[PDB]
């Protein structure tokens with residue numbers, strides 16, 4: 205029994221179950237990537253993720269047609285590619301490469317960014333469906349103010365009341381407790397498994413594999429199946445560590461940290477290119493993204509967990525996440541993606557990359573692109589930029 | 604007459620001068636209030652001057668060290684001016700995190716302009732929940748202290764209530780102006796309307812209140828005039844560049860209503876009554892509507908605009924799209940559909956503070972003016 209097989213089947217099972225629920229008349233929701241999923245899980249609700257569906261379509265090379273559709277409707281190419289791709293899916297009534305049913309309700313959380321707010325207002329107006337908002341106001345202070353905590357917990361309550369109406373069920377305190385435990389564990393397996401690269405040398409996996417497994421921790425964070433899935437994976441990764449093996453082809457001459465989401469429409473090309481150069485990512489900020497840890501039945505802690513996701517904390521803390529991931533990963537350099545779609549991540553990258561480089565003493569480089577719009581990435585450019593970094597690392601390497 | 608327009612002109616054409624004058628004539632500090640919504644009443648109660656910051660026409664250079672090319676034009680301007688020291692005369696600035704770009708500017712600002720205090724404020728999306736209001740009050744108490752740390756003295760509960768009163772009087776006076784300008788659409792050219800409203804960002808509101816009341820008087824003494832050309836409603840972040848305003852005028856277009864964040868959005872909703880001052884301010888945010896920055900799953904913006912168009916027999920709606928403004932870009936399709944669905948024609952024009960070769964808008968506006976002719 206292989207981890208990848210179970211993972212892919214578990215992922216594909218989320219979609220099927222969603223279509224089934226749709227068929228039987230049970231509500232299906234669409235949710236942002238770091239929403240408090242525990243709130244809908246306790247109700248056994250089927251929840252799909254627009255960001256995941258869009259990355260999947262982009263990988264399958266079919267996000268262009270959808271962005272062009274959204275664009276013909278008046279949506280500016282300036283807007284995040286995930287939203288354009290999703291608007292095209294809605295207007296087109298789905299797609300062929302990776303289809304999913306329309307939502308009956310939405311779950312939105314701006315801890316990752318504020319664009320999903322507008323994006324979701326549109327879907328709600330478009331389909332005339334309930335929109336549950338968990339607003340985690342940006343943390344300018346090093347710590348989450350008590351005001352933010354009370355406010356978030358209060359919204360957790362509003363969400364629950366809304367979901368009782370939507371699901372037609374009553375909140376079960378006992379079930380909500382088990383999901384908390386389940387969610388807490390999967391959060392732990394995610395941070396642990398995806399952190400192994402920081403050791404080994406060679407790393408037990410190719411940094412990019414993280415983004416494949418990233419799908420499970422995103423759509424099924426409160427399910428027992430995920431727990432077993434990550435357990436099988438771990439066992440395989442450790443088996444590799446102990447045998448000096450890995451999914452990363454060839455020798456691992458260089459260890460780096462890539463900042464940002466990879467360009468899904470060119471994930472294949474990006475994999476090959478880095479491999480031929482002996483470059484592998486063993487430093488990542490993502491093992492923290494879905495860690496989301498809190499004590500069982502501790503709404504204050506849960507609130508803090510979701511508000512502290514790295515996209516919602518001051519520049520200083522954002523910078524520390526990188527510096528830390530570089531060091532712990534024993535990285536030789538930093539590779540930055542200037543993502544045309546993600547303004548939140550792109551508009552603080554300059555200052556952030558300056559600070560991390562001046563603290564870690566490691567060299568860096570960057571490239572232009574987009575996670576779902578194939579028009580923003582240029583292959584020829586990616587190659588010369590990573591090669592440029594390689595020259596520097598190899599240069600400082602041999603004294 | 605020139606008398607009033609002159610005064611307003613001198614303050615809009617030279618914002619920095621006025622800030623200096625005020626500080627010396629009063630011996631008090633001035634706080635900059637960034638785009639869209641800020642609790643000016645708290646700044647005002649303190650005796651300080653709330654100074655609106657809405658960028659301006661400028662090339663980009665120093666901003667390139669913190670922002671890539673795709674940051675919205677207006678915020679690119681604010682940062683440039685910031686790095687150039689054009690705001691050094693302020694003792695601080697409030698940069699509300701209304702969207703990702705405003706949030707990122709606030710983080711870079713803390714590093715790129717260390718000498719000008721950055722006061723944080725994030726309005727709640729769930730502004731209708733009682734919890735949203737209590738949270739916003741806390742943000743406001745936080746805003747209060749920071750302002751107190753700057754001016755030195757304490758800001759009195761009584762003074763805030765007093766300030767809230769001054770502002771509400773200002774808002775209703777402004778709304779009054781809108782109806783008077785509308786009755787005099789040939790006298791009040793687009794550039795005039797803009798000047799009468801924008802000048803309110805550079806002087807104490809009570810002082811602006813008197814200026815507008817006088818102008819309204821001179822205008823009442825004039826017979827009600829029927830517009831000789833086509834009327835339109837502008838909507839978006841802003842449309843203050845002399846360039847765009849001239850184009851409308853050259854095509855004999857009269858602006859009789861707007862849904863601009865720099866203009867009518869600032870005064871169409873009054874601060875509610877209440878015993879608690881900060882609570883009153885917080886609840887105004889609960890009552891804002893038809894704004895791209897104000898959470899509304901129903902997106903009533905389109906419908907509200909339609910109502911304004913029909914109220915004043917407006918001939919067209921012009922989307923003054925700020926370049927690379929995502930909140931506004933998301934709103935466009937649906938808000939446009941609501942309007943066109945109601946039989947109203949619309950035009951799309953891009954607002955770029957870094958360009959100085961506006962020709963696209965001229966041809967689009969000329970074609971729109973000719974289109975409305977039938």
Ligand SMILES: CC(C)C[C@@H](O)C(=O)SCCNC(=O)CCNC(=O)[C@H](O)C(C)(C)COP(=O)(O)OP(=O)(O)OC[C@H]1O[C@@H](n2cnc3c(N)ncnc32)[C@H](O)[C@@H]1OP(=O)(O)O
Nearest residue numbers: 212213215216237255256259260316415416419422465493
């Ligand atoms: C910090 C962040 C939160 C913030 C911010 O930066 C962001 O926004 S961050 C953004 C946050 N990002 C993310 O969440 C995402 C990570 N993205 C990925 O790459 C995912 O792995 C995925 C989408 C491909 C998963 O979805 P999924 O695994 O379901 O796609 P999958 O590749 O599995 O499809 C092929 C499978 O489906 C089946 N089949 C289909 N049609 C068929 C037909 N007609 N006939 C027959 N079969 C058909 C096949 O059997 C095949 O194998 P199965 O499965 O048995 O083996």
Ligand code: SF4
Nearest residue numbers: 284286316317319546
């Ligand atoms: S990509 Fe950046 S903007 Fe597009 S959704 Fe993920 S976080 Fe929000």
Ligand code: SF4
Nearest residue numbers: 675702704925928929
């Ligand atoms: S993105 Fe739009 S709303 Fe945000 S600061 Fe820019 S113009 Fe203002």
Ligand SMILES: [S]
Nearest residue numbers: 638639677840
């Ligand atoms: S703005």
